[PDB]
Design a protein around this ligand. Structure first.
Ligand SMILES: C[C@H](P(=O)(O)O)P(=O)(O)OP(=O)(O)OC[C@H]1O[C@@H](n2cnc3c(=O)[nH]c(N)nc32)C[C@@H]1O
Ligand SMILES: [Cl-]
Ligand SMILES: [Cl-]
Ligand SMILES: [Cl-]
Ligand SMILES: [Cl-]
Ligand SMILES: [Mg+2]
Ligand code: NA
Ligand code: NA
Ligand code: NA
Ligand code: NA
Length: 326
DNA sequence: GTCGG
DNA sequence: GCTGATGCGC
DNA sequence: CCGACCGCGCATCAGC
């Protein structure tokens, strides 16, 4: 919040480029600048001062000068007045509706919450659950609630098979005082990069969580990734809790560290780390860290026994989860 | 939109 | 049915 | 300049 105005402006620009212009690289360019500036420990006094930071070039520096000078950006003011851009930006806020679907709906004259509701027929499953919980998915989750959710998930998982290990990642593992959703990394000894000795390992867990009425809806579901909705149970006479988004990722047990590194994030941290990896001649995914041959082709997985080993490989000092919120 | 070679 | 591309979201 | 921009699971489609 030290340079809140500037980062907000940058985030709005990033969203515009992503949702309206469908220019993902500009989207990421703006996000990185925002990230770098949110981390800067000084109140920015000029675009020149900001341009010193990596990721902030001439264009953004110019915008920062205008913002500091007037408290706003003409480019944005105009975008806000544009109906198409506004409608497209809004629709993309529905889980399941991306830039393409948003622009398509706007072409059909579907541009509002009211319109989406009376046109459910034109939505796929995911988009339909997204509209249903539009309001709720906008709400933040207090860490105190995340703690109750963690308690239920781990205990329910324990009831299915004592050997399951459920770990809450995302911003929660990064120590956030509030989270946008719940991310759960799951492992079982029967599922390794070597073999799958038991089927339905994820399904059994999802089923058990639906049985106790914790998971209420399913956005998408596969053998290793579940994306859906959950809700804490409420007491007698009390308003029930908002529905929350929940992601569950089943990863080979022997690949836990690369998995927990990935799922802990942040997303920008992961992008920065994976890019650095490349520069160092390594490629990193949620399963392994592999070296890049002279040709540039991924080699065999390198041994990993902790998150720090991954950091060591790329010559980065270890950063605790709480310091990976970029 | 920003960067490094 | 399949495979491969595209959208979406993590 | 100008090529690079992280890497992937699931849903849905086109084309066979
Ligand atoms: C602050 C967010 P919340 O609290 O509001 O939920 P969060 O939990 O941090 O992010 P979530 O969107 O929940 O995704 C979970 C993780 O997935 C990883 N992740 C997400 N997007 C990406 C991506 O584009 N790339 C990679 N490599 N990892 C990603 C890193 C993320 O941490
Ligand atoms: Cl782009
Ligand atoms: Cl503005
Ligand atoms: Cl690992
Ligand atoms: Cl791999
Ligand atoms: Mg999260
Ligand atoms: Na810079
Ligand atoms: Na969306
Ligand atoms: Na979110
Ligand atoms: Na998530």
């Amino acid at each position: 919040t030290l340079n809140g105005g500037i980062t907000d402006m940058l985030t709005e620009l990033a969203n515009f480029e992503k949702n309206v212009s469908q220019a993902i690289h500009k989207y990421n360019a703006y996000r990185k600048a925002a990230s770098v500036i949110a981390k800067y420990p000084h109140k920015i006094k000029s675009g020149a001062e900001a341009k010193k930071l990596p990721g902030v070039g001439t264009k953004i520096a110019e915008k920062i000068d205008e913002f500091l000078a007037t408290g706003k950006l003409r480019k944005l003011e105009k975008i806000r007045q544009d109906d198409t851009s506004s409608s497209i930006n809004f629709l993309t806020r529905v889980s399941g509706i991306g830039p393409s679907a948003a622009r398509k709906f706007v072409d059909e004259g579907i541009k509002t919450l009211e319109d989406l509701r009376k046109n459910e027929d034109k939505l796929n499953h995911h988009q339909r659950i997204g509209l249903k919980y539009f309001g709720d998915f906008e709400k933040r989750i207090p860490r105190e609630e995340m703690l109750q959710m963690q308690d239920i998930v781990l205990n329910e998982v324990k009831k299915v098979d004592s050997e399951y290990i459920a770990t809450v990642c995302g911003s929660f593992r990064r120590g956030a005082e509030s989270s946008g959703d719940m991310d759960v990394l799951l492992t079982h000894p029967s599922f390794t990069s070597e073999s799958t000795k038991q089927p339905k390992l994820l399904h059994q867990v999802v089923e058990q969580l639906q049985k106790v009425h914790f998971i209420t809806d399913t956005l998408s579901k596969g053998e290793t990734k579940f994306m859906g909705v959950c809700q804490l149970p409420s007491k007698n006479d009390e308003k029930e809790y908002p529905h929350r988004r929940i992601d569950i990722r089943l990863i080979p047990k022997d690949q836990y560290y690369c998995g927990v590194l990935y799922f802990t994030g942040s997303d920008i941290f992961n992008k920065n780390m994976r890019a650095h990896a490349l520069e160092k001649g390594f490629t990193i995914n949620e399963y392994t860290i592999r070296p890049l041959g002279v040709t540039g082709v991924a080699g065999e997985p390198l041994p990993v026994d902790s998150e720090k080993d991954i950091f060591d490989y790329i010559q980065w000092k270890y950063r605790e989860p709480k310091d990976r919120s970029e």
